[PDB]
From a paper:
There are several bromodomain subfamilies; Brd2, Brd3, [name], and the testis-specific protein Brdt belong to the bromodomain and extra-terminal (BET) family.
To verify the specific binding of inhibitors to [name] bromodomain and obtain the structural information to develop further optimized inhibitors, we determined five three-dimensional structures of [name] bromodomain–inhibitor complexes. The ethoxy substituent in 8ab in the middle of the scaffold resulted in four-fold increased activity compared with 8ae, indicating the importance of size and position of functional groups on the benzooxepino[4,3,2-cd]isoindol-2(1H)-one scaffold in maintaining inhibitory activity. In contrast to 8ab structure, the structures of 8bc, 8bf, and 8be contain an ordered water molecule forming a water-mediated interaction between the side chain amine of Gln85 and oxygen atom of 6-ether at R4 position. The position of R4 seems to be critical for these water-mediated interactions, considering the absence of a corresponding water molecule in 8ab, which has a methoxy group at R3 position instead of R4 position. In addition, these inhibitors form several hydrophobic interactions with Pro82, Leu92, Tyr139, and Ile146. The formation of π-stacking interaction between phenol ring of the core structure and indole group of Trp81 is also a remarkable feature of these inhibitors.
Residue numbers in the entry: 44 to 166
The structure:
Amino acid sequence: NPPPPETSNPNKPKRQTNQLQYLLRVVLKTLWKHQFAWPFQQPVDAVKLNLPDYYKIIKTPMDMGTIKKRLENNYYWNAQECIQDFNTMFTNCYIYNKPGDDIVLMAEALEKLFLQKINELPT
Ligand SMILES: CCOc1c(OC)ccc2c1Oc1c(OC)ccc3c1C(=C2)N(C)C3=O
């Protein structure tokens, strides 16, 4: 396993916005409770899951546990930076797998719910 993505970085500037607060309180914390959220709640453990190929394929890993910690740390500058991490998480799953796979059906459902929730953000 590679080290997981950073959740703090002292030389990166922090920020808190209404949209970032919403991304934690509403978007992440609601998606977290979905029946399909469990594979996406922590970094992929390639040793545990017996996927020695995972990090040979996926070079920018991302997961909701990392995103949650970043939001709690005020790690992001703006909501778009956080949204990009969600999009990276979804696209990694499409890249690593193939259409119709159970894990892909899970990501597809979560992506739709994510888009529903971010369609309208606070001002
Ligand atoms: C059966 C293992 O389930 C787990 C799980 O278990 C604690 C924890 C994380 C994952 C996971 O499953 C899979 C797969 O399973 C065959 C196949 C592909 C992917 C994942 C996955 C998340 N991601 C992100 C994938 O791209």
